[PDB]
């Protein structure tokens, strides 16, 4: 599908993805305003060729997934400025879960279905043979107060048939509070790692992404802010010792020891997203 510059009219910026911003824009051919809304990513002008190859895979990840709980894309529009491609999404109304969480006190079971929700596009995208790399609240897209998507796929690989695991390379931009220790250590990215992460974001769901419970400041308050070049190393040596994100408030010991099994230092030792889907659906249901 192919969308004309000429009728996209912007309205505001929503944000900065991995590989460039997103724009809110009208894409109004009529002219009259009754035009749909859409949400367009866009790589930098001045992006290097690494950038740019890395681009160009994310819109053929994207362009390939259909899954309720995944961002529906729309279309490209060819950008002649910076000579790519720009990124066109379905808009998402209520946006990401780290900004909508703090201005809506959210229900225990609402926030237990979007885990769910998060688990069963997951679960999606691991069998078409792709690892997420940042799954995190300000990833995950609402489009209403029973439905949730999976939004930036700007870290997304394809993990070859025969293996079981990504090698990544040492990157400033990197979320490592977010990362299981193999990632960290090895650099290896595996499907149980994308788990770990899942963890993570259902930690910062259950604090309602409370900034001053967020992962950095949590994890930063142990390491200490003055390490040198060994903040990773410590955060690393912490989780090897079986340190952990601390229980939220209000938040039931039966979802902390869930979340606590997605953050198994050994990777086999955690469930799939195959084997959460039953189990959020259960829990789910006692809380509702
Ligand atoms: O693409 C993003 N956000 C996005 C996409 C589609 N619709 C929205 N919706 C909104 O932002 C809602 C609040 C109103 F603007 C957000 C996005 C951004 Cl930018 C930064 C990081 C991660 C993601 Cl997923």
Redesign the pocket.
Known sequence: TVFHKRYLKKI???????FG??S?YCYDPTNDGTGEMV?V?ALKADAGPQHRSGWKQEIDILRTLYHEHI?KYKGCCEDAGAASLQLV????????LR??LPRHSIGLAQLLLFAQQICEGMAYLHAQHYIHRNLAA????LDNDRLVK???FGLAKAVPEGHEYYRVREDGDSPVFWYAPECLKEYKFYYASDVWSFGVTLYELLTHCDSSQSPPTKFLELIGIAQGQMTVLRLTELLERGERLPRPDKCPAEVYHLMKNCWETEASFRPTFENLIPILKTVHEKYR
Do not use: Q, T, W
């Not at 300000?138 to 897209?141: E, K, P, Q, S």
């Open positions: 505001r910026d929503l944000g900065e993805g991995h911003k997103v809110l949400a990513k961002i999404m379905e808009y998402v109304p209520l946006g990401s900004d909508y300000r990833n995950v897209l999976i939004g930036d």
